[PDB]
């Protein structure tokens, strides 16, 4: 039982490490690709909600 | 002479008695610490080995 909970906690911190660098490196590719489709883009649709 | 037999009947009596009891204690107490040694042996062996597997 001590080796599956030592694994269980393991396996659990990897997935959110990985999750976290995975957000990360959507954030990254998002914010490049929002700068070459233009940022002056989103700024009317902005302006809707307002 | 009754009185005499009764007491060297009592005194050997007692010291097989005494004999009988050390003996069968000191088995049982060797018996179980032979297999409570092994026991907790086993699960080091194994939780150390199951560690670095699971790691």
Same mark, same amino acid.
């Given at each position: =039982?001590? +080796?599956?909970? %030592?694994?269980?906690?393991?396996?659990?911190?990897?997935?959110?490490?990985?999750?976290?660098? $995975?957000?990360?490196?959507?954030?990254? $590719?998002?914010?490049?690709?929002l700068?070459?489709?233009?940022?002056? =883009?989103? !700024?009317?649709?902005?302006?809707?909600?307002? | %002479?009754?009185? =005499?037999?009764?007491?060297?009947?009592?005194?050997?009596? !007692?010291?097989?008695?005494?004999? %009988?009891?050390?003996? !069968?204690?000191?088995?049982?107490?060797?018996?179980?610490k032979?297999?409570?040694?092994?026991?907790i042996?086993?699960?080091? #062996?194994?939780? %150390?080995?199951?560690?670095?597997? +699971? #790691?």
């Amino acid at each position: =039982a001590q +080796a599956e909970q %030592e694994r269980i906690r393991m396996l659990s911190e990897a997935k959110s490490q990985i999750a976290d660098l $995975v957000t990360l490196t959507a954030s990254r $590719v998002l914010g490049a690709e929002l700068q070459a489709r233009g940022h002056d =883009a989103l !700024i009317a649709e902005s302006l809707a909600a307002l | %002479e009754q009185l =005499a037999n009764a007491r060297r009947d009592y005194e050997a009596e !007692i010291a097989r008695a005494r004999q %009988e009891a050390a003996k !069968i204690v000191a088995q049982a107490q060797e018996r179980a610490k032979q297999q409570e040694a092994e026991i907790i042996a086993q699960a080091r #062996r194994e939780a %150390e080995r199951l560690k670095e597997e +699971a #790691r």
